[PDB]
Amino acid sequence: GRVLIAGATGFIGQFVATASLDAHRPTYILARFKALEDKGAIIVYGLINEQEAMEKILKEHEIDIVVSTVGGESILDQIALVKAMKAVGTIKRFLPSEFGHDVNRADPVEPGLNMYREKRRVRQLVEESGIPFTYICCNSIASWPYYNNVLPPTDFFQIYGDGNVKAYFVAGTDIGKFTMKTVDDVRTLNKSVHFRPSCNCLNINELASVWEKKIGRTLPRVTVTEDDLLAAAGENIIPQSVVAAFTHDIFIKGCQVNFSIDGPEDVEVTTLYPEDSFRTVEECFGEYIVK
Numbered sequence: 001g002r003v004l005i006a007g008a009t010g011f012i013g014q015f016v017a018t019a020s021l022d023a024h025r026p027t028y029i030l031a032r033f034k035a036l037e038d039k040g041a042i043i044v045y046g047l048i049n050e051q052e053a054m055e056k057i058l059k060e061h062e063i064d065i066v067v068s069t070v071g072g073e074s075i076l077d078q079i080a081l082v083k084a085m086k087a088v089g090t091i092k093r094f095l096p097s098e099f100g101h102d103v104n105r106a107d108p109v110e111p112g113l114n115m116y117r118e119k120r121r122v123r124q125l126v127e128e129s130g131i132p133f134t135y136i137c138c139n140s141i142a143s144w145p146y147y148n149n150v151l152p153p154t155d156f157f158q159i160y161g162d163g164n165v166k167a168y169f170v171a172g173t174d175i176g177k178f179t180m181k182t183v184d185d186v187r188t189l190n191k192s193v194h195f196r197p198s199c200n201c202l203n204i205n206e207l208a209s210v211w212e213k214k215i216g217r218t219l220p221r222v223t224v225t226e227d228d229l230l231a232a233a234g235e236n237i238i239p240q241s242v243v244a245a246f247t248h249d250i251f252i253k254g255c256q257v258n259f260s261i262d263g264p265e266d267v268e269v270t271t272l273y274p275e276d277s278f279r280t281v282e283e284c285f286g287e288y289i290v291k
């Protein structure tokens, strides 16, 4: 199947585009990069918010799989993309711009809640339009989780709340690799795919300690309270306050870990692809040290 990726120069999109090419999939990358092209990508021109233009591309290039990685501020640009895929009727799988939490289960404060409102709206449209779908709920990219946003700190650690709430951290390269595995898997059709690598389930205190090992010394630790984060969210400064709201949901409320994925509409990456190891946080934090 031919893959079209929208947002391939984006933060997440670069990993997904690169993984697709590595897997020897025919990959088309939508342009409003040199490394992408050298690796085999075909560049096509347009914007996902122009319905007619998208219908043309999907038809002319015989696209089977569409993956959108547009940013938090462009979620509703996908509305015209969904109408376009419904029109051409030949799409075998659509992955919207999801790449985070389960937007149905999580309940962040504003203004994070508005972004989830928009992603839910796109899901409703996808499902009513009968387009086959996969929702990538891949939790947190493996990084230092700065409340407003590279590298982890070298002065002091800001620890949210008790620093004892677990989250899942996934290498950008693993986000890409495992995402592309799902696009034509029978087991991920019309499912949410959750990324729960058991070795990468860490709290902020454990993240700090991993980093302390890498830098060969300790830093003081200071508390950033729940109210500190809610005050930052309450400023409604975009996109910083959005990240503050998500930080509160993850590290104060436990949103990544506080639900079962046992039901028929949820699958989990490590059980789908057994004996296929995720990179560790130790490993990722090791490559920052090469700078």
Ligand SMILES: NC(=O)C1=CN([C@@H]2O[C@H](COP(=O)(O)OP(=O)(O)OC[C@H]3O[C@@H](n4cnc5c(N)ncnc54)[C@H](OP(=O)(O)O)[C@@H]3O)[C@@H](O)[C@H]2O)C=CC1
Pocket (backbone or CB within 6 Å): 006, 007, 008, 009, 010, 011, 012, 013, 030, 032, 046, 047, 048, 049, 069, 070, 071, 072, 074, 077, 097, 098, 099, 100, 101, 138, 139, 140, 141
């Ligand atoms: N799990 C995690 O830790 C994280 C997850 N997220 C999620 O990942 C998703 C991707 O966001 P992130 O990588 O920051 O996105 P970026 O802002 O880094 O990249 C967005 C990409 O979308 C392209 N784009 C935007 N609008 C259009 C359009 N109308 N038509 C065609 N292309 C368009 C942009 O192109 P251009 O530059 O030309 O405008 C850009 O290449 C979001 O849903 C976000 O919520 C993102 C970061 C952290």
